[PDB]
Design a protein around this ligand. Structure first.
Ligand SMILES: Cc1cc2nc3c(=O)[nH]c(=O)nc-3n(C[C@H](O)[C@H](O)[C@H](O)COP(=O)(O)O)c2cc1C
Length: 138
């Protein structure tokens, strides 16, 4: 499997790592890829797309790298299964509600409730691992 993410200070990156650990613990292999190093063609062959991005202003996906990536794959992901996650600070998850709506709008099937954690995982570490385990059970 593959996990693609954008992280500005490392919070979402840490989540990606933990999610990967859960998939690996379930017996499967997974590679975490920063959005800047992703190859669209290879990503599009995947059964499930696991995508993560922290909340940027104002309650939107990161604009210089992540959003362009999403816009680029938008027309080629109808029917694909996707799992969403990300870290946020002061909001209540609005950016993720929108991200979920957007992906559904492109024809994707959002397989699980998006995982959102405030700031660094730390206390939510097991939650991240468990989310990975749920995806591996799909
Ligand atoms: C410029 C900027 C704008 C932000 N806007 C929001 C926002 O609208 N809502 C929110 O909850 N957090 C907001 N945050 C906080 C980040 O989502 C939060 O610090 C998160 O933990 C960053 O994760 P990352 O290290 O993976 O980037 C913003 C952070 C930055 C740097």
């Amino acid at each position: 499997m593959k996990i693609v993410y954008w992280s500005g200070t490392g919070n979402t990156e840490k989540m990606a790592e933990l999610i990967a650990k859960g998939i690996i613990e379930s017996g499967k292999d997974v590679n975490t890829i920063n959005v800047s190093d992703v190859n669209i063609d290879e990503l599009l062959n995947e059964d499930i797309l696991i995508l993560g991005c922290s909340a940027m202003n104002d309650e939107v996906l990161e604009e210089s790298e992540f959003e362009p990536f999403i816009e680029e794959i938008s027309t080629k992901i109808s029917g694909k299964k996707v799992a969403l996650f990300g870290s946020y600070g002061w909001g209540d998850g609005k950016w993720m509600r929108d991200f979920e709506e957007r992906m559904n709008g492109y024809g994707c099937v959002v397989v699980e409730t998006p995982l959102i954690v405030q700031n660094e995982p730390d206390e939510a570490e097991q939650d991240c691992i468990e989310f990975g385990k749920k995806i591996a059970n799909i």
